[PDB]
Amino acid sequence: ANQASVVANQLIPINAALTLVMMRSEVVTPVGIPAEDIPRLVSMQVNRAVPLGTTLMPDMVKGYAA
């Protein structure tokens, strides 16, 4: 597997806007939002709490559509 996903680098509280310190890139399964989309996720809000080490999925970000 070579495809990396965005993984929460800290607990992201419900309704928080994403910042760069919150997002790392890891090869995990199941695959979530592509790690190269991290720039484009900044300031978007999550619709649930995302614990440390959880893969960020399309349905967890408000307004995500790519």
From Swiss-Prot:
Annotated keywords: Antifreeze protein, Secreted
Main subcellular location of this protein, as a coarse class: secreted
Keyword match Chloroplast: no
Membrane-traversing stretches: none
Superkingdom in the source lineage: Eukaryota
GO cellular component, one term: extracellular region
Site (Important for ice-binding): residue numbering on this chain: 10, 15, 19, 45
Gene3D superfamilies: Antifreeze-like/N-acetylneuraminic acid synthase C-terminal domain (3.90.1210.10)
AFP-like domain mapped to chain residues: 5-64
Tissue: Detected in blood serum (at protein level).
InterPro entries on file: AFP_Neu5c_C, AFP_Neu5c_C_sf, Antifreeze_III
Cellular localisation: Secreted
Family: Belongs to the type-III AFP family.
Physiological role: Contributes to protect fish blood from freezing at subzero sea water temperatures. Lowers the blood freezing point. Binds to nascent ice crystals and prevents further growth.
Protein name per UniProt: Type-3 ice-structuring protein HPLC 12
Source species: Zoarces americanus (Ocean pout)
Organismal lineage: Eukaryota, Metazoa, Chordata, Craniata, Vertebrata
